[PDB]
Amino acid sequence: SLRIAVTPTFTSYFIGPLMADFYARYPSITLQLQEMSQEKIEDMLCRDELDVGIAFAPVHSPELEAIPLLTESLALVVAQHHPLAVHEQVALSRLHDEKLVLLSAEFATREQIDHYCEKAGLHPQVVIEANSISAVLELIRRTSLSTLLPAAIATQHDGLKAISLAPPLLERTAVLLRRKNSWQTAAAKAFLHMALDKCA
Amino acid sequence: RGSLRIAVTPTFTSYFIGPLMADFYARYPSITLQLQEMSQEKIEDMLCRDELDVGIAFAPVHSPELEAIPLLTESLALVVAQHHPLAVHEQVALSRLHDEKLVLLSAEFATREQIDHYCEKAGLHPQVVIEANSISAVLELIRRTSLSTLLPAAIATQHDGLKAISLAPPLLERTAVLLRRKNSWQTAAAKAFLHMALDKCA
């Protein structure tokens, strides 16, 4: 009965493949996956309500151990018919003229976006906000709007492309979390190992 | 030149609201849009407090101060990947669920609540090997395995690698509804949105 929790960005590109592979390898293990804020993941782990979590550094809880997983970098994600979809990379200043669909303020990703946009002197117009990554992706594929999301998400979807931002806007280190000195089951350990191999 | 605050229950995020909002935006680019998926209860509550302009959920509505407009009928289907053994059929007997290993939404979702209730009622107790608090995650799991899930048939249409198999005796059918607080006049945008919502279901 492996209980997994991840911050919202991972749901859109990381966890699906990994869990599918794990299930295929170990069909007898019942899986539970929940996406939620990092704070809630850290708290639930402390209370042994979860076996493994996936979030970002820095971890706020001392009783938790963090193992670097990968680097997540924000890109301008657009549909193939977007004017900028022709480039592989674009200058950060381009954001000024972009009409964006973004995740709402309760998402850590949106918080970081605002902070670093402010820091870089960028204030693009946000015409649409949604509290769902899937909703944002749907909106971008059907319009000429763009969004700011981890580049890894575009790879998962055909009609979407991730445009790297010249001076990068946001880079974060994804981490695997587990409560220290509270030992793991064979399934949990296998899962952690699989998560690392996939990122190797 | 105004704003439009929309709320919808989870299933609509996966097939209905995306196309509708994209069309609305294209038609009225000057209107700022805000979309939030949440439980029906929270949608009804927020509407009563004028914290939303329009909501989409299901009958029956519990709040008297809200007006409901029938939108469409949502029926649960067995959603599988094209390589699923049953993907060859367009319809299967409900008894098939017994042998299915399912990936379902967790207990906090009304959709899961209804699934459990009607399965119990029909004398069906399929094995649930994976639970997730996200429709997207469920879909990704189904695409990559030979498991199946129970979701609105309309979702499969949106995804190529997925097929919705109709259930002989249906399992669950719900009336989707548009919600707006009565006697509290709507903006031009809100009214336009409602009309567009209906046209797309016409």
Swiss-Prot record, chain A:
Compartments where located: Cytoplasm
Keywords of this entry: Activator, Cytoplasm, DNA-binding, Repressor, Transcription, Transcription regulation
Section covered of the full-length record: 92 to 291 of 299
GO molecular function, one term: DNA-binding transcription factor activity
Gene source species: Escherichia coli (strain K12)
Protein name: HTH-type transcriptional regulator CynR
Primary site of residence: cytoplasm
Tagged with keyword Repressor: yes
GO cellular component, one term: cytoplasm
Induction: Negatively autoregulated.
Family: Belongs to the LysR transcriptional regulatory family.
